[PDB]
Amino acid sequence: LAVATITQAEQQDRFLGRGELDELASYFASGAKRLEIAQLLTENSEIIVSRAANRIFQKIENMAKSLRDLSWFLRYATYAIVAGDPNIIVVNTRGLREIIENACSGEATIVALQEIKAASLSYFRKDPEAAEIVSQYMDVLITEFKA
Amino acid sequence: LAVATITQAEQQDRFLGRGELDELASYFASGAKRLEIAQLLTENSEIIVSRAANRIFQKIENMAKSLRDLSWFLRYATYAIVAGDPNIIVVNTRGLREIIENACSGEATIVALQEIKAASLSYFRKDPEAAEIVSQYMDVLITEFKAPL
């Protein structure tokens, strides 16, 4: 949020401070990378979601929907990574476990999500920097779902 | 802005296209470059305002306010550069010309504003692309102050 830093400093009749400028400088510097990551995760979304569903294959009853949802879970994660804002994951995963746990298995879902993390991480073996971003944003997705 | 792209992807329940992914790459590159310019103008604000002030001191009947306003102009410019939105300058310099011609001299203010532009630009000697940016935004600031009442 660049407009949000501005509206704060405006209120105090002041220039943006070093941290504020440094945080914004990084938000943009890391853009290229965050987008590289989202491109691979997308290009390989189907492979990734396959690995996750098979890992819990025998716990699934509606296959159409688990394949939908695992894909969605990955999609909102590519959103977050592109926006470099983990709150996107936080808002759409709100009260979602309560729904899934009625629908099928909450535990099965978490094991699947973990395999999504794994599968994603498998594409950044030569790039520890990117791996950390993928881990970070994935972890946020699993933790919000656990609640 | 990226939220803009993501939100209209979110409504089709789709991943981002490579087109959208590439238009986001440019946006980010521009943003980084703008923030490098804001850091410099902000780190060097005082130096930049003194030079502006010194260019017109003989005519100043209120040093504190003149310094303050000089600082306020540069301030809102970095606001605009950070956001990449020049309308921040249009909106906050509306009717500023009349207020200031009454308080002191509009002719003096313009000279001083020229010097802010000059001084700011002197931190980007080895960087034509950054200079173009600084210059566009400064020119907006000056233009909108020299608009009709």
Ligand SMILES: *[C@H](C)[C@H]1/C(=C/c2[nH]c(/C=C3N=C(/C=C4\NC(=O)C(CC)=C4C)C(C)=C\3CCC(=O)O)c(CCC(=O)O)c2C)NC(=O)[C@@H]1C
């Ligand atoms: C004259 C050569 C110098 C000068 C003097 C000066 N200005 C004022 C009063 C005001 N100045 C402003 C300026 C701004 N307000 C803003 O929001 C911004 C950001 C873009 C600026 C630059 C305003 C709003 C006022 C009136 C409100 C107030 O008084 O605080 C005075 C006071 C005298 C008077 O009010 O009649 C003086 C002496 N300003 C210059 O820019 C010249 C360098």
Ligand SMILES: CCC1=C(C)/C(=C/C2=NC(=C\c3[nH]c(/C=C4\NC(=O)[C@H](C)[C@H]4CC)c(C)c3CCC(=O)O)/C(CCC(=O)O)=C2C)NC1=O
């Ligand atoms: C983060 C983005 C996001 C997700 C994931 C999401 C899921 C989501 N899954 C749902 C249902 C469902 N979910 C599943 C099951 C599964 N789904 C899984 O992710 C598991 C792999 C598996 C069980 C563990 C089933 C079977 C239903 C249908 C429930 C029904 O028809 O009653 C519903 C109820 C509405 C609907 O039927 O579409 C939502 C909102 N919504 C979202 O906005």
